[PDB]
Amino acid sequence: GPLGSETYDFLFKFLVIGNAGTGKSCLLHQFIEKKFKDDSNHTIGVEFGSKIINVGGKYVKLQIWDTAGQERFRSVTRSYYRGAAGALLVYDITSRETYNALTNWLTDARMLASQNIVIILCGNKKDLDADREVTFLEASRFAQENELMFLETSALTGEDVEEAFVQCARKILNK
Numbered sequence: 001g002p003l004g005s006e007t008y009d010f011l012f013k014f015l016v017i018g019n020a021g022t023g024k025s026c027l028l029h030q031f032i033e034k035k036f037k038d039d040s041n042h043t044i045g046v047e048f049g050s051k052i053i054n055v056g057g058k059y060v061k062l063q064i065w066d067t068a069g070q071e072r073f074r075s076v077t078r079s080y081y082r083g084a085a086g087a088l089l090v091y092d093i094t095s096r097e098t099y100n101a102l103t104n105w106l107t108d109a110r111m112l113a114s115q116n117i118v119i120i121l122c123g124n125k126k127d128l129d130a131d132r133e134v135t136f137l138e139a140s141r142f143a144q145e146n147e148l149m150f151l152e153t154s155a156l157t158g159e160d161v162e163e164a165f166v167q168c169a170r171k172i173l174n175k
């Protein structure tokens, strides 16, 4: 994967944000490696990944900053919002607390990045439907009201992970 071997037309800076334990790191690992990370522990500060996707015939390299959700890491994660084109905003459909935090994540994102940062809302862990605390309906209405894209995902199965990243990039390229 050296510099001279890659082909891309666009370079986008993305970040993944949301409460601790929502599955942000598993989402990135799923996207890059097409595997469910085993024994995922809390991210210490931040981690990084990149992947080139095909969006409408153009190749887009996504530089992805997987930020720690724990409040102790707030100060070291400020940097990754600045000049970011898009963000996956993640909550856990089994934890209402993670959903209730979205307004604050959203507000901080739009203040630190440009107000027009493209945000896709990811209701993660949808494979755990027996433990669901947040309905699809209320989340979709929250997204509509706050001009966010929205889908539910499973980092465990892989379902909708690729689509979340791709649709975020798609919206950036085209009005």
Ligand SMILES: Nc1nc2c(ncn2[C@@H]2O[C@H](COP(=O)(O)OP(=O)(O)NP(=O)(O)O)[C@@H](O)[C@H]2O)c(=O)[nH]1
Pocket (backbone or CB within 6 Å): 018, 019, 020, 021, 022, 023, 024, 025, 026, 027, 037, 039, 040, 041, 042, 043, 044, 067, 068, 069, 070, 124, 125, 126, 127, 128, 153, 154, 155, 156, 157
């Ligand atoms: N069943 C299920 N478990 C998931 C899913 N995504 C993540 N998990 C699990 O949920 C826990 C947290 O995942 P993790 O990616 O580490 O969360 P995080 O948002 O990165 N946490 P932090 O902000 O502290 O780094 C782990 O035990 C992980 O295996 C999912 O889609 N389904």
Ligand SMILES: [Mg+2]
Pocket (backbone or CB within 6 Å): 024, 025, 026, 041, 042, 043, 066, 067, 068, 069
């Ligand atoms: Mg993490």
